[PDB]
């Protein structure tokens, strides 16, 4: 009956809470208290990239630490080179209300997705100067928030109707559908070893999913409002999440609970995007008013501040070898710090 | 010059040419948002403004006085709308459509107006407001089967505004009720305004033909009041 099911659910929740409190013998901020801080870190814009017309919504670093992508709400996907700050390719999108983009792991395709429940995939080596369109993956009821490529023939998508999905491009039909959420989802990242991934939605929830089985392996709580950014720590055994109440947190999977918390007493502006460093020592976040903040990911302190924007920060990424950091905001300018 | 620099310069030049061409086209066209209720009658004015000419969003285009307008109707989404409105924080105006003939839902429509008005990312956009289905309200209050006082008390203590203009030759009670509703909306509109954004109420019914012109005039006033604050 319904009452018996509710009682069983409450008892299992009590059991899980007791189990999670059993192994909470320490906190991250207590063990790494004696690690030498990186000190004062400042970075002057080395190149300044211009050309857009409106808000900037997504940005992904190429496999080479040389190429770049930018994606805006005026109807533009621009493929950049960062050395000579030269524009290499321009692709006019079909839909303009678009919120995600990505490179292929071998630098051959790109993908984009917007409010229309569609993920459009283009290929780069084409005889025409155009980057032609080759695929459209469809089957959601809502809007897409992010998309990443496991390899050149298996991709992953998350939408705002409680679901996630794994897809095989050549045929164009889901292989497995990931359900178990309650609200709309915002961001997923792929495991370094390419076997799992994780997801966060607008609840107090983030989940760790296997890929080829479909069964959901872990569930995490903690946040007071929606969730806006997530990624992978390099060894594929941690993550950090940011929320729309001005708070970041850091979890480790096997511990199955939050380890450390990033907050300040005078921040009342939320978070938009987050990324890690290539050595596991810089955590870089874009906040709600006009700033980016670079954090030392083991101390919950502020290593440095990045300014120069006249509006909100929404995109942040690091190179594939430690060469720069790109930030993008509603002021229509990307900036490359080194 | 080496080949690499040749290719880089040619590519950057061509792409900058294209983007410079596209700037004017992006700035030439105006963008609007459309909100309303299920019984409100959105599609009615959508057809009336198409006269002026699966998927998660729908588009409509029209042309008034050599100026183009794009409306973005939202369908095939869910009933939580606190995340896909954020992307509409750079548009000229919001068309809010409400019905004037059902007292069980007028409070909900008022709450919707309250919610849109006080939003952080929407504190710079004007609201054009359409009261619709007036004839049904007239028939309802003329029949007298049920009273507006059943749901709205202070109607027992209200006199017609001194600047009310009942042109078509209507009964006084019709004018009383109309101005009661309009004052209910404008009370919210003037409670916390700050000279940046203003409402623009209107009176219309399902058989109107002059809605896009009203949108035109409010948009013109908005653009004018914007220039006189960035230059002078």
């Amino acid at each position, epitope marked *: 009956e319904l009452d018996q099911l509710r009682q069983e659910a409450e008892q299992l929740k009590n059991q899980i809470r007791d189990a999670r409190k059993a192994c909470a013998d320490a906190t991250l901020s207590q063990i790494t208290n004696n690690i030498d801080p990186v000190g004062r870190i400042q970075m002057r814009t080395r190149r300044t990239l211009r050309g857009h017309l409106a808000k900037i919504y997504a940005m992904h670093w190429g496999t080479d630490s040389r190429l770049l992508v930018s994606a805006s709400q005026d109807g533009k996907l621009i493929i950049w080179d960062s050395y000579t700050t030269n524009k290499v390719h321009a692709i006019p999108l079909r839909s303009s209300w678009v919120m995600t983009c990505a490179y292929a792991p071998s630098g051959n395709y790109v993908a984009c997705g917007g409010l229309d429940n569609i993920c459009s995939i283009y290929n780069l080596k084409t005889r025409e100067g155009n980057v032609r369109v080759s695929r459209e993956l469809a089957g959601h009821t809502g809007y897409l928030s992010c998309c990443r490529f496991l390899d050149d023939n298996q991709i992953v998508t998350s939408s705002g109707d409680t679901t996630c999905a794994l897809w095989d491009i050549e045929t164009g039909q889901q292989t497995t559908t990931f359900t178990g959420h309650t609200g709309d989802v915002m961001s997923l990242s792929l495991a370094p070893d390419t076997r799992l991934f994780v997801s966060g939605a607008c609840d107090a*929830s983030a989940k760790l999913w296997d890929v080829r089985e479909g069964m959901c392996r872990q569930t995490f709580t903690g946040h007071e409002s929606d969730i806006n950014a997530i990624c992978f720590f390099p060894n594929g055994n941690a993550f950090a999440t940011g929320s729309d109440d001005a708070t970041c947190r850091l979890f480790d999977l096997r511990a199955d609970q939050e380890l450390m918390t990033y907050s300040h007493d005078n921040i009342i502006c939320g978070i938009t995007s987050v990324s890690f460093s290539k050595s596991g020592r810089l955590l870089l976040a874009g906040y709600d008013d006009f700033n980016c903040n670079v954090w030392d990911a083991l101390k919950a302190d502020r290593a440095g501040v990045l300014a120069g924007h006249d509006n909100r920060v929404s995109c942040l990424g690091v190179t594939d070898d430690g060469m720069a950091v790109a930030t993008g905001s509603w002021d229509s300018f990307l900036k490359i710090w080194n | 010059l080496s080949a690499e620099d040749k290719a880089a310069v040619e590519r950057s030049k061509m792409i900058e040419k294209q983007l410079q061409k596209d700037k004017q086209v992006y700035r030439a066209t105006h963008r609007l948002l459309l909100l309303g209720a299920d019984n409100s009658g959105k599609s009615t004015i959508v057809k009336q403004m198409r006269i002026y000419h699966t998927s998660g969003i729908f588009e409509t285009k029209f042309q008034v006085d050599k100026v183009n307008f794009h409306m973005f109707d939202v369908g095939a989404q869910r009933d939580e709308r606190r995340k896909w409105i954020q992307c509409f924080n750079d548009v000229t105006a919001i068309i809010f459509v409400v019905d004037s003939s059902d007292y069980n839902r007028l*409070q909900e429509a008022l709450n919707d107006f309250k919610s849109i008005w006080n939003n952080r990312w929407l504190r710079t956009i004007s609201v054009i407001l359409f009261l619709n289905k007036q004839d049904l309200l007239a028939e309802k209050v003329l029949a007298g089967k049920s009273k507006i006082e059943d749901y709205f008390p202070e109607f027992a203590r209200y006199t017609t505004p001194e600047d009310a203009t009942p042109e078509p030759g209507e009964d006084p009670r019709v004018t009383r009720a109309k101005y009661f509703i309009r004052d209910e909306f404008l009370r919210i509109s003037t409670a916390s305004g700050d000279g940046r954004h203003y409402c623009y109420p209107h009176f219309t019914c399902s058989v109107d033909t002059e809605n896009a012109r009203r949108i035109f005039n409010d948009c013109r006033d908005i653009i004018q009041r914007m220039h006189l604050r960035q230059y002078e």
Partner: nanobody, 127 residues
Framework: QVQLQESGGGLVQPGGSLRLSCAAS????????MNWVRQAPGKGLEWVSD????????SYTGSVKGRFTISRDNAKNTLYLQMNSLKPEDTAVYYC?????????????????????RGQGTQVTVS
């Protein structure tokens, strides 16, 4: 996570005074706008009352313009509705709704079909 639990249902004949309470846990309740919504049998979701951060701004509904009271405690973390003289047209179940975001005055989607931050409901039948 998010906990909203109601209290104060029952059945009564017309002319009764009741006290609906809703307790919250799982956030800092000092700075969140709150509301009361209800659903009557066979009806949808309709809004009853609203109250802001500190307690200086109070608002109600015309249908209940003279009968009800909306109060709150930011120390006992509880939202209250108070009723004095009821009607047979008020049989429903009551939910207390939290606002989505903190530190802000606009409030979206508390009347939605499914909502992450809404309680279970309490039954009130007057006949």
């Amino acid at each position: 996570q998010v906990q909203l639990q109601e209290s104060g249902g029952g059945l009564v004949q017309p002319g009764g005074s009741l006290r609906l309470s809703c307790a919250a846990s799982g956030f800092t309740f000092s700075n969140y706008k709150m509301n009361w919504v209800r659903q009557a049998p066979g009806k949808g979701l309709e809004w009853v009352s609203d109250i802001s951060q500190s307690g200086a701004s109070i608002s109600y509904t015309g249908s209940v313009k003279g009968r009800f009271t909306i109060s709150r405690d930011n120390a006992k973390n509880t939202l209250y509705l108070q009723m004095n003289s009821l009607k047979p047209e008020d049989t429903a179940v009551y939910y207390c709704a939290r606002c989505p975001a903190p530190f802000t005055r606009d409030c979206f989607d508390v009347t939605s079909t499914t909502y992450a931050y809404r309680g279970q409901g309490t039954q009130v039948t007057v006949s």
